[PDB]
Design a protein around this ligand. Structure first.
Ligand SMILES: [Mg+2]
Ligand SMILES: [Mg+2]
Length: 171
RNA sequence: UUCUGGUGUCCUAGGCGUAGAGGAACCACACCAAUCCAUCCCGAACUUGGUGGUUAAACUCUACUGCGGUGACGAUACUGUAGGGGAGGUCCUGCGGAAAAAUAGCUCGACGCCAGGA
């Protein structure tokens, strides 16, 4: 019912709770979410403009922020592309948007996925960061995407402990 | 004369890593706000204006020779010069010069200026 749940629930309840878990000598050693990078790659984006200009608006309503036409780092003929042409669709979420986006993730989009049985807890990279893959975006109440969550954690255990508190149903 | 910060020159370039110290002041980060300004998206960075929590990260100081960097003397190779062998490939001698490599060893910088503090 409150305005910002995660921002208030984190600073008040989680930081005293997560500090007691690992017994950090300082409060600043606690991890926290830095950003959420939402990628959406389309190889055939160079062909059409309607499918490009439309999908850019689809993600914007999901995030409340414009995507960015991500360009190629180098040309290659195996996938018939050229340098400087747009291939990916990306955006950066920081501050309150990443929390508001996470509220729309665990409670709106992630439950509505067909045949849902929890997300893989082995998706951590080994340095506290976490990633998610989608096939559809209509689960958001308004094609796939690679949501990349960043965190200041060194190991994955405190991250798994961190993410699990803010929902994130793991099998 | 020392401590902190700022700013340099010299230099064998003085770093990585490990183990400690620092918060009064100083430096830094963290927290909040956003139309002077900014984002091929995002107040992260950049810019204003605020709260002072923390030395966690950075940075500063103290130590070492584990990596790294540095590095001989001596000897030998090579070589100038005057000569001499061998069918040739190439080799030897006298006078003079003289390494690289490796090892020992050295190395966790040296010296200034301004402000503040003692
Ligand atoms: Mg010698
Ligand atoms: Mg040598």
């Amino acid at each position: 019912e409150t305005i910002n749940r995660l921002k208030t629930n984190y600073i008040e309840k989680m930081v005293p709770l997560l500090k007691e878990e690992f017994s950090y000598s300082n409060i600043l050693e606690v991890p926290k979410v830095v950003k959420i990078v939402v990628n959406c790659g389309i190889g055939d984006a160079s062909q059409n403009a309607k499918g490009l200009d439309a999908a850019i608006n689809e993600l914007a309503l999901i995030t409340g922020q414009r995507p960015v036409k991500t360009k190629a780092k180098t040309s290659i003929a195996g996938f018939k592309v050229r340098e400087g042409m747009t291939l990916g669709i990306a955006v950066t979420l920081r501050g309150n948007l990443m929390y508001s986006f996470l509220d729309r993730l665990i409670n709106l989009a992630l439950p509505r996925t067909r045949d849902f049985q929890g997300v893989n807890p082995n998706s951590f990279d080994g340095h506290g960061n976490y990633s998610v893959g989608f096939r559809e975006q209509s689960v958001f109440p308004e094609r796939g995407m690679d949501v990349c969550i960043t965190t200041t954690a060194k190991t994955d255990k405190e991250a798994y402990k961190l993410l699990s508190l803010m929902g994130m149903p793991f099998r």
